[PDB]
Amino acid sequence: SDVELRVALPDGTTVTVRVKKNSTTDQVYQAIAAKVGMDSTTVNYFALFEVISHSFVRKLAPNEFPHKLYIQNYTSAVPGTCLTIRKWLFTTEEEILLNDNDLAVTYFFHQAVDDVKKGYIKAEEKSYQLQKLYEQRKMVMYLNMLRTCEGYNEIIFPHCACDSRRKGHVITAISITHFKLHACTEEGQLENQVIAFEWDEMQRWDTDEEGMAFCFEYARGEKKPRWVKIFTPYFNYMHECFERVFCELKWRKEEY
Amino acid sequence: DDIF
Numbered sequence: 087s088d089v090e091l092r093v094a095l096p097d098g099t100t101v102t103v104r105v106k107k108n109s110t111t112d113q114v115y116q117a118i119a120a121k122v123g124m125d126s127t128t129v130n131y132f133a134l135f136e137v138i139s140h141s142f143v144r145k146l147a148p149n150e151f152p153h154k155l156y157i158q159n160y161t162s163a164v165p166g167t168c169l170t171i172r173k174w175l176f177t178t179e180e181e182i183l184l185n186d187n188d189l190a191v192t193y194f195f196h197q198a199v200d201d202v203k204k205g206y207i208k209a210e211e212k213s214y215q216l217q218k219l220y221e222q223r224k225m226v227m228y229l230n231m232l233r234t235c236e237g238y239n240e241i242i243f244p245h246c247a248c249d250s251r252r253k254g255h256v257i258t259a260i261s262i263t264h265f266k267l268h269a270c271t272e273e274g275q276l277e278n279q280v281i282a283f284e285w286d287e288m289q290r291w292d293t294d295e296e297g298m299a300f301c302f303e304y305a306r307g308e309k310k311p312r313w314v315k316i317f318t319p320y321f322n323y324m325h326e327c328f329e330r331v332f333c334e335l336k337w338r339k340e341e342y
Numbered sequence: 343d344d345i346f
Contacts, residue, residue, distance in 0.1 A: 250344060250345045250346070251345075252343065252344055256346075267345075267346075279346055281345055281346065314345065
């Protein structure tokens with residue numbers, strides 16, 4: 087049938103692609119990557135996401151149909167589209183290897199600036215020095231500095247209920263270094279406690295479609311393995327994050 | 343119970 091799809095890019099522009107109506111996310115993604123000029127190396131570093139809210143975007147699963155999501159969230163107004171291209175990478179050294187690829191650097195740079203604006207990357211103490219690199223468009227230098235801040239390449243999920251808290255919610259934060267749960271109220275106001283699970287402690291993990299839950303079983307210190315249920319509507323994205331983190335850990339090619 |  088062939089239909090139109092608009093997708094937002096990290097530099098704040100959008101691209102339009104013609105695709106078959108029933109294209110799945112990877113087919114749309116490859117059509118976009120070719121159109122914007124990604125090569126065989128760079129294409130592995132980005133993915134298709136849906137804008138859920140101002141503060142959260144969720145990765146499209148392989149069995150989704152991006153045209154369905156597009157039409158369903160479409161209006162005559164709406165600043166663009168709910169589909170967006172974002173980086174999909176937890177290991178920051180792999181992206182340092184791309185400092186000589188203009189496309190990658192540009193996309194990494196624009197998404198990082200927006201991720202600072204939104205609070206994901208805690209860059210406050212060097213806000214001025216980053217701002218002058220931003221002003222001079224010293225993109226690699228800006229990124230080389232920013233990659234040393236807290237929250238670079240961390241996925242933060244919206245607060246939700248957890249079966250291992252009597253009262254209150256958790257905000258989960260997934261990075262290459264560990265899986266973190268931040269305690270907060272049922273409103274989403276940060277309490278002040280943080281549990282940090284090492285990936286080595288992770289025994290198994292799973293989803294519960296019926297119960298709308300992501301589950302993980304951890305073994306800590308010396309105690310018996312235990313299951314924790316996080317009641318997030320984004321259990322499939324969370325599950326994809328675990329799969330991706332262990333993949334990047336196996337293929338880690340650096341001691342630092 | 344609570345891990346928190």
